[PDB]
Curated annotation (Swiss-Prot), chains A, B:
Biological classification of the source: Bacteria, Bacillati, Actinomycetota, Actinomycetes, Mycobacteriales
Xref: InterPro entries: EthR_C, Homeodomain-like_sf, HTH-type_TetR-like_transc_reg, HTH_TetR, Tet_transcr_reg_TetR-rel_C_sf
GO molecular function: DNA-binding transcription factor activity; transcription cis-regulatory region binding
SUPFAM superfamilies registered for this protein in UniProt: Homeodomain-like (SSF46689), Tetracyclin repressor-like, C-terminal domain (SSF48498)
Self-association state and partner proteins as the record states: Homodimer.
Originating organism: Mycobacterium tuberculosis (strain CDC 1551 / Oshkosh)
Name the record gives this protein: HTH-type transcriptional regulator EthR
Length: 194, 194
């Protein structure tokens, strides 16, 4: 039942490590998960749809892991807060790299993926904005940019800066030194007057 | 001769406004530029290759426009310098939006496009890094992040922040208020101590 479903997915993920969706056939995922062609079609209606579901696993992994953090305020200095917020991306997407990458690539095509990714970003940008407003009201950060706008840029930086490093792009900040980077950019711009 | 070539391209660009490469045929670009199917193939060996050449026009437009600026130091305060540097992106890519978008989308596929875009970024990040080192040596910016690393993140933010706004994404900073945004992020992080 679900046994079968999950293998389709685990297999989806592992063939994705070394090659893009396109050059993975549909008998590719079947053969791997040890099921017949049409046994697959019962479970997922197209390969695109497999990739969708895995991305969904990942995003929610990162959604959930992110809300736990929100509800558990770490007890630390503002800089070490932001870092620990940002890190939850580095750890999640930085674990399922293969899916992470393909997901991004296929925003181009899937109006479903484009949506799925958008929704999550809006959620966290809005939340991030919410923080900054509060950081300004607690008095500890000054009122320079519209918060929601700042957040968007900062968050979009992350999405791109992070996924550049994962795919190991040319050019890109190495996994090691990233974070410290974004984190630095986050503090200096949130708390910075001029 | 070149008459014919250029029309293929102008047409390439205008059909791209309202729909993606994929759903533009090859008789699409011919019919538009008023030439026969194989007359086209003499000029460009595939549609992908048309898109390549237009992206090249744009990048170099922005490359050139960017080096003029470099060689003509604007006479203004550091903040109004960075802005006028960044603006040269907003104006270029923000003019050929259609090409700008498709180019990005098709980094996924074209190892030629991926290269073409990379090279340009490396160039400007390296240059941007070069500035910051100097800004630190003239004493006016403090030595916090490795410059080249900072530059990368800042530049990758731009690429993504900008092209999000162009395609008018959900979520994205509106064209109006962008710049002021990135610019703010640039100053606060370059000149910011903590």
């Amino acid at each position: 039942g679900d046994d079968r479903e999950l293998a389709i997915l685990a297999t989806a993920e592992n063939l994705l490590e070394d090659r893009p969706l396109a050059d993975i056939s549909v008998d590719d995922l079947a053969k791997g998960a040890g099921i017949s062609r049409p046994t697959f079609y019962f479970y997922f209606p197209s390969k695109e749809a497999v990739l969708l579901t895995l991305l969904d696993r990942v995003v929610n992994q990162a959604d959930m892991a992110l809300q736990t953090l929100a509800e558990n305020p770490a007890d630390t200095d503002r800089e070490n807060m932001w870092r620990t917020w940002i890190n939850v991306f580095f750890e999640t997407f930085g674990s399922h790299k293969a899916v992470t990458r393909a997901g991004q690539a296929a925003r181009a095509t899937s109006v479903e993926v484009a949506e799925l990714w958008s929704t999550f970003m809006q959620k966290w940008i809005a939340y991030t904005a919410a923080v900054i407003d509060a950081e300004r009201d607690r008095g500890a950060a000054p009122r320079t940019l519209p918060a929601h706008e700042l957040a968007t840029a900062l968050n979009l930086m992350n999405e791109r800066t992070l996924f550049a490093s994962f795919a190991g792009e040319q050019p890109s900040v190495p996994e090691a030194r990233v974070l410290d980077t974004l984190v630095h950019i986050w503090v200096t711009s949130i708390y910075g007057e001029n």
